[PDB]
Curated annotation (Swiss-Prot), chain A:
Cytoplasmic-side positions: 3-250
Record gene name: zntB
One cellular component term from this protein's GO annotations in UniProt: plasma membrane
Organism: Salmonella typhimurium (strain LT2 / SGSC1412 / ATCC 700720)
Protein name per UniProt: Zinc transport protein ZntB
Note in the entry: A role in zinc efflux has been proposed by Worlock et al, but ZntB was later shown in E.coli to likely mediate zinc uptake, using a transport mechanism that does not resemble the one proposed for homologous CorA channels.
Coarse class of the protein's main subcellular location: membrane
Catalytic activity: Zn(2+)(out) + H(+)(out) = Zn(2+)(in) + H(+)(in)
Length: 250, 247
């Protein structure tokens, strides 16, 4: 509560995908101009940075440092965390669609163009009254959902590959496709895994010890995923080589 | 037609709900052993994965990769699309029934336990020569039909809440809570499914024209809107929870 409160009207963007106050018990209520936003009543503002009103807010609001306005407007790629004083700027990837957020103890503003399937898990939990109760718990639930999705996909590639290891030669272009996807997962998940690890050790006021603990688990989970991606990549290379032998045996 | 034909003998399951061969002009004929199955004349096998022959077939047949075998047996919950090389595995929901299918250019095997009413619109069309003419057209008409049922249900949910609001203007515990519970169940299932439709529209699948993608996009965007309605209804119920509180 070391921070100054915010007026609802100050973050009440009309064309926002979501404009919510967390009720501190797992649910949400509609943001309103007269609400007071503080660390016990955080606001989550979710925007399509393409919609008119959203772009203008993003472009002019005093609540954002000048240097993050562009990022949130889409000008960011690599998974990354940064600190702009009291605030924290985070870019994350899903399986590659991107989620960009600026948040502090009082509020979160996240933006995207293409929908982030991970956020729907959090929105559903909130609608059900079983979501995050504060800003720290929100980021943790988001990073957890992103990791659920990344993990599920990594395992899907693993199974298709295991299948290939037996079932005859593969259809033309397929093995080359799996390899390409693994390499794309690797390129973006390695940095993102470092974002998780940093949030887990960085001393954030609005992140508790439990929060940093949950994150570290999420970071190790993802770490184990990159490990599996790497073994899979090696297998796709071995498979291509041995496929060439099968063909030469004509 | 980059794939080689299937015997039709290799795809006969006596207890099959129905096994059809499409005529590539909007109609079907019942499948037969000598029949030739290919991209021009695809086959639709519709299974109740409970029945003995169907289950044994799903388990044994070499037409299906092994890693999709368990799913078609009911071992899948969330809507999902997975590319298994030549084939694609799709899990889909209707309002909550599940439909599961593996398909390529030549054939479709779909499975369910409880009936998926949506399919009745695809089957009727076929029974009348106005159905799909190839595998890509089938997948589109099927998603279209499911989105239709979902959409009608969403609309019906909204109207129920309006009826509630009209009564409150002329002024039943749990009624609101049930509605809310229904809306969230809907939201839970429909978010992922919209993602599936979105994939089929972005994915480069041989047996889908650009038109099929065009139509898949329309269906995805339409399910997107449906989720907006659901969220609007959800927020509506929370307000009403108070409008009653004051009483
Ligand atoms: Zn503070
Ligand atoms: Zn995701
Ligand atoms: Zn999920
Ligand atoms: Zn592997
Ligand atoms: Zn072909
Ligand atoms: Zn033919
Ligand atoms: Zn119908
Ligand atoms: Zn409504």
């Amino acid at each position: 509560g070391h921070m100054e409160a915010i007026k609802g009207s100050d973050v009440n963007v009309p064309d926002a995908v979501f404009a919510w106050l967390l009720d501190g018990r797992g649910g949400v209520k509609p943001l309103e101009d007269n609400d007071v936003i503080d660390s016990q009543h955080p606001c989550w503002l979710h925007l399509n940075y393409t919609h008119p009103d959203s772009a203008r807010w993003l472009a002019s609001t005093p609540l954002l440092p000048n240097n993050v306005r562009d990022a949130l407007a889409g000008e960011s790629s690599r998974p990354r965390v940064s600190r702009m004083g009291e605030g924290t700027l985070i870019t994350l990837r899903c399986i590659l669609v991107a989620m960009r957020l600026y948040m502090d103890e009082r509020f979160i503003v996240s933006t995207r163009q293409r929908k982030v399937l991970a956020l729907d898990d959090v929105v559903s939990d909130l609608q059900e009254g079983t979501g995050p109760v504060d800003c720290g718990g929100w980021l943790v639930d988001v990073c957890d959902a992103l990791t659920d999705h990344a993990s599920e996909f990594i395992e899907e590639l693993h199974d298709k590959i295991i299948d290939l290891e037996d079932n005859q030669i593969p259809p033309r272009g397929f093995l080359a496709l799996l390899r390409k996807q693994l390499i794309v997962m690797r390129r973006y998940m390695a940095p993102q895994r470092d974002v998780y690890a940093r949030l887990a050790s960085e001393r954030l006021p609005w992140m508790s010890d439990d929060h940093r603990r949950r994150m570290q688990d999420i970071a190790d989970r993802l770490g184990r995923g990159l490990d599996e991606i790497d073994a899979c990549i090696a297998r796709t290379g071995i498979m291509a080589d041995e496929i060439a032998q099968v063909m030469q045996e004509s």
